[PDB]
Amino acid sequence: SMSLSTRIAPHLPYLRRFARSVTGSQSSGDAYVSAMLEALVADISIFPRASCDRIGTYWLFCHLFDQAKLSYLTPRARQAFLLIAVEGFNEQEASEIMNLDARDFRKLLNQASIDISQQIATQVMIIEDEPLIAMDIEQMVESLGHQVVGIARTRKEAVVMYHQKKPRLILADIQLADNSSGIDAVNDILQNDRIPVIFITAFPERLLTGERPEPTFLVTKPFNPDMVKALISQALFFKENASK
The missing domain is CATH 3.40.50.2300 (Response regulator)
Known part of the structure; x- marks a missing residue:
């Protein structure tokens, strides 16, 4: 119930979707998700104890691999739009995931909206x-x-x-x-x-x-x-x- 695996396991499927969307392939996206599990084994206390299970999982994924970092593959602006548009988080949940103020996160969505509008x-x-x-x-x-x-x-x-x-x-x-x-x-x-x-x-x-x-x-x-x-x-x- 409180078991650490039972908090995390149900959210790994959708976390791979976010990982694949950010990396560009199953092999690369799934690899980051497995590396996260290995990181948790090395020190189980890195998981936030008072967060909701799903938000804690995504926060940790971004915390380990984004300060090859995730930003080198998909810019943070587009990651911000992915968390809302695909992963189904609201603005504050995603801001908590990316560890940012509301002002810095709203600026990322606007930059993401700019980058997409420039695509052919x-x-x-x-x-x-x-x-x-x-x-x-x-x-x-x-x-x-x-x-x-x-x-x-x-x-x-x-x-x-x-x-x-x-x-x-x-x-x-x-x-x-x-x-x-x-x-x-x-x-x-x-x-x-x-x-x-x-x-x-x-x-x-x-x-x-x-x-x-x-x-x-x-x-x-x-x-x-x-x-x-x-x-x-x-x-x-x-x-x-x-x-x-």
Whole structure:
């Protein structure tokens, strides 16, 4: 109940999502989460005893790896927007996580909003069979300034549409009509093509165990524009730095 592991274990799945979103890969993101657990073993008292379990876990993760530091991979401004838009913390929770005053944290969100607005708009292909979901994500992507080149509903459509339209980013549901894997479909479609993919699921924790190959970016349905905006922004940032 008070057991230190039981306070931390339920929050590791979502912490890997934050780690993957900040590092750019499962291998790098999951590695930081494991290193955090090793750090806690060396000195168990580094965990905050009066914080809420989830806030203490994220605070510790940022405390160990951000004063290769996290800021070298994703600037703190964009980390601040990730904590709100993806990890679901409020402004004070995230400020406590990043150990900052409200004035310094609000300045980070504005800088993050500036950096994203300077990003070049991309062409997005959506793989989604449910119309209400495809309608929603298509409207959100275009509202953020990006272009939706097509919506594939089945794997067969997606193979045709991908080679026909050659998108620069893919938003794909993990499950399709016949319970077929959207993850397998994207993998078969891309082959060695290095195209950023963001997967949509109602249960992201199932792909955040760290026990097997898992996606880097997970949009949670029900989603909201901030979540999609941040994850698209991060996918484009890592792709740009890799190409340059």
